[PDB]
Amino acid sequence: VYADSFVIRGNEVSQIAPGQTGNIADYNYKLPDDFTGCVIAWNSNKLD
Amino acid sequence: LSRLDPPEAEVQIDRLITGRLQSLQTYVTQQLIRAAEIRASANLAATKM
DSSP: OOOOOOOOOGGGGGGSSSSOOSTTTTTTOOOOSSOOSOOOOOOOOSOO | OTTSOHHHHHHHHHHHHHHHHHHHHHHHHHHHHHHHHHHHHHHHHHHHO
C-alpha cells in the first residue's frame, strides 16, 4: 500500500486520474493506467 | 496513437485486434474443411492408381 499525498488547486482534482493530460499531469504526478488504488480528495480551507 | 492518448488507444486497438483475429480463425477453419476434401480426392486417385 502506497500512500501519496499533496495539495492541489480547486479546479485540478479532475486531472488526478489514470491517462490524462494537463499542466499538473505532464511532469508533476503521472498516474499510470495500471492503477488499482483510490483517489481521495477533499476541500481543505482554513487549515491551509 | 498519433491522435489519441493511451487509455483510449488500448480500447481502439483491442477492437481491431479482435476483428482481425476473427479473420484468421475463419481462414484456418476453412482450410481444414477444404483440405479434407482434397485428401478424400487424393485417396480416390491413389486407389485408382
